[PDB]
Amino acid sequence: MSELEKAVVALIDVFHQYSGREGDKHKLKKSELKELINNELSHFLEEIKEQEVVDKVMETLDSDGDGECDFQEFMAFVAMITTACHEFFE
Amino acid sequence: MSELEKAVVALIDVFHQYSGREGDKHKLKKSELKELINNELSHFLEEIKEQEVVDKVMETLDSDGDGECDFQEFMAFVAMITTACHEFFE
Ligand SMILES: CCOC(=O)C1=C2N=C(S[C@H](C(C)=O)C(=O)OCC)c3ccccc3N2NN1
Ligand SMILES: CCOC(=O)C1=C2N=C(S[C@H](C(C)=O)C(=O)OCC)c3ccccc3N2NN1
Ligand SMILES: [Ca+2]
Ligand SMILES: [Ca+2]
Ligand SMILES: [Ca+2]
Ligand SMILES: [Ca+2]
């Protein structure tokens, strides 16, 4: 398995670790998204310490407006992060 | 660096390895895309052995219709692959 293939597997793996905690087990609710960002994105994103930031991030990622982050919305979140890191250093 | 962070870095790293080979060094031309798929996606995608498959894949990924795969189009390609693997096993 190449580095890219590992990256594909990691994306699926992390999303499921967090989404299967509570409620709908194929979607990230706000508390699951927060912990995902806090535990797994600590070198890229500011630790989230406030409800209003949790709320705004979910507002941003939630394209279909159902209150949670599904797998496709997670993939779009990853693309945002990846494009930002890319553009920082390019 | 967590597994997700590694995956973010790998995405940027692989795209640049391949895109900087020839011509526009921030885009994948057909030959660079083919080698990327052949070398780095061999467990997920069929080896590409034919010009018409190279052509069709590029046709598919090339949303802005400029003939090449830019970083955003690459990110969409990764999402396709990730969603397909996700749905296979779910
Ligand atoms: C946000 C408060 O804490 C920090 O900024 C720290 C931080 N931040 C980053 S980058 C990350 C980004 C790009 O938003 C970030 O959280 O900073 C906010 C501007 C980082 C990267 C590698 C190694 C250690 C790091 N680190 N240690 N404390
Ligand atoms: C395409 C011709 O060669 C193959 O199919 C091989 C193949 N294929 C896969 S999966 C991959 C997918 C899902 O499209 C694929 O190329 O198969 C086409 C149906 C694979 C995964 C793990 C380990 C070894 C593997 N492997 N060894 N020969
Ligand atoms: Ca959930
Ligand atoms: Ca949603
Ligand atoms: Ca190129
Ligand atoms: Ca294009």
From Swiss-Prot, chains A, B:
<dbReference type="GO" id="GO:0007613">
    <property type="term" value="P:memory"/>
</dbReference>
<feature type="binding site">
    <location>
        <position position="73"/>
    </location>
    <ligand>
        <name>Ca(2+) 2</name>
    </ligand>
</feature>
<dbReference type="GO" id="GO:0071638">
    <property type="term" value="P:negative regulation of monocyte chemotactic protein-1 production"/>
</dbReference>
<feature type="binding site">
    <location>
        <position position="22"/>
    </location>
    <ligand>
        <name>Ca(2+) 1</name>
    </ligand>
</feature>
<dbReference type="GO" id="GO:0048168">
    <property type="term" value="P:regulation of neuronal synaptic plasticity"/>
</dbReference>
<dbReference type="GO" id="GO:0045666">
    <property type="term" value="P:positive regulation of neuron differentiation"/>
</dbReference>
<dbReference type="GO" id="GO:0016310">
    <property type="term" value="P:phosphorylation"/>
</dbReference>
<keyword id="KW-0539">Nucleus</keyword>
<dbReference type="GO" id="GO:0042803">
    <property type="term" value="F:protein homodimerization activity"/>
</dbReference>
<feature type="binding site">
    <location>
        <position position="86"/>
    </location>
    <ligand>
        <name>Zn(2+)</name>
    </ligand>
</feature>
<feature type="binding site">
    <location>
        <position position="68"/>
    </location>
    <ligand>
        <name>Ca(2+) 2</name>
    </ligand>
</feature>
<keyword id="KW-0963">Cytoplasm</keyword>
<dbReference type="GO" id="GO:0019210">
    <property type="term" value="F:kinase inhibitor activity"/>
</dbReference>
<feature type="binding site">
    <location>
        <position position="62"/>
    </location>
    <ligand>
        <name>Ca(2+) 2</name>
    </ligand>
</feature>
<dbReference type="GO" id="GO:0005829">
    <property type="term" value="C:cytosol"/>
</dbReference>
<dbReference type="GO" id="GO:0044548">
    <property type="term" value="F:S100 protein binding"/>
</dbReference>
<keyword id="KW-0964">Secreted</keyword>
<feature type="domain" description="EF-hand 2">
    <location>
        <begin position="49"/>
        <end position="84"/>
    </location>
</feature>
<dbReference type="InterPro" id="IPR028481">
    <property type="entry name" value="S100-B"/>
</dbReference>
<dbReference type="GO" id="GO:0005509">
    <property type="term" value="F:calcium ion binding"/>
</dbReference>
<dbReference type="GO" id="GO:0050786">
    <property type="term" value="F:RAGE receptor binding"/>
</dbReference>
<dbReference type="GO" id="GO:0006417">
    <property type="term" value="P:regulation of translation"/>
</dbReference>
<dbReference type="GO" id="GO:0043123">
    <property type="term" value="P:positive regulation of canonical NF-kappaB signal transduction"/>
</dbReference>
<dbReference type="InterPro" id="IPR011992">
    <property type="entry name" value="EF-hand-dom_pair"/>
</dbReference>
<dbReference type="GO" id="GO:0097490">
    <property type="term" value="P:sympathetic neuron projection extension"/>
</dbReference>
<dbReference type="InterPro" id="IPR001751">
    <property type="entry name" value="S100/CaBP7/8-like_CS"/>
</dbReference>
<feature type="binding site">
    <location>
        <position position="24"/>
    </location>
    <ligand>
        <name>Ca(2+) 1</name>
    </ligand>
</feature>
<dbReference type="GO" id="GO:0005654">
    <property type="term" value="C:nucleoplasm"/>
</dbReference>
<dbReference type="GO" id="GO:0005576">
    <property type="term" value="C:extracellular region"/>
</dbReference>
<dbReference type="GO" id="GO:0005634">
    <property type="term" value="C:nucleus"/>
</dbReference>
<feature type="modified residue" description="N-acetylserine">
    <location>
        <position position="2"/>
    </location>
</feature>
<dbReference type="GO" id="GO:0043025">
    <property type="term" value="C:neuronal cell body"/>
</dbReference>
<dbReference type="GO" id="GO:0001726">
    <property type="term" value="C:ruffle"/>
</dbReference>
<dbReference type="InterPro" id="IPR013787">
    <property type="entry name" value="S100_Ca-bd_sub"/>
</dbReference>
<dbReference type="GO" id="GO:0048156">
    <property type="term" value="F:tau protein binding"/>
</dbReference>
<dbReference type="GO" id="GO:0008270">
    <property type="term" value="F:zinc ion binding"/>
</dbReference>
<dbReference type="Pfam" id="PF00036">
    <property type="entry name" value="EF-hand_1"/>
</dbReference>
<dbReference type="InterPro" id="IPR002048">
    <property type="entry name" value="EF_hand_dom"/>
</dbReference>
<feature type="binding site">
    <location>
        <position position="26"/>
    </location>
    <ligand>
        <name>Zn(2+)</name>
    </ligand>
</feature>
<dbReference type="GO" id="GO:0007611">
    <property type="term" value="P:learning or memory"/>
</dbReference>
<comment type="subunit">
    <text>Dimer of either two alpha chains, or two beta chains, or one alpha and one beta chain. The S100B dimer binds two molecules of STK38. Interacts with CACYBP in a calcium-dependent manner. Interacts with ATAD3A; this interaction probably occurs in the cytosol prior to ATAD3A mitochondrial targeting. Interacts with S100A6. The S100B dimer interacts with two molecules of CAPZA1. Interacts with AGER. Interacts with PPP5C (via TPR repeats); the interaction is calcium-dependent and modulates PPP5C activity. Interacts with TPPP; this interaction inhibits TPPP dimerization.</text>
</comment>
<feature type="binding site">
    <location>
        <position position="16"/>
    </location>
    <ligand>
        <name>Zn(2+)</name>
    </ligand>
</feature>
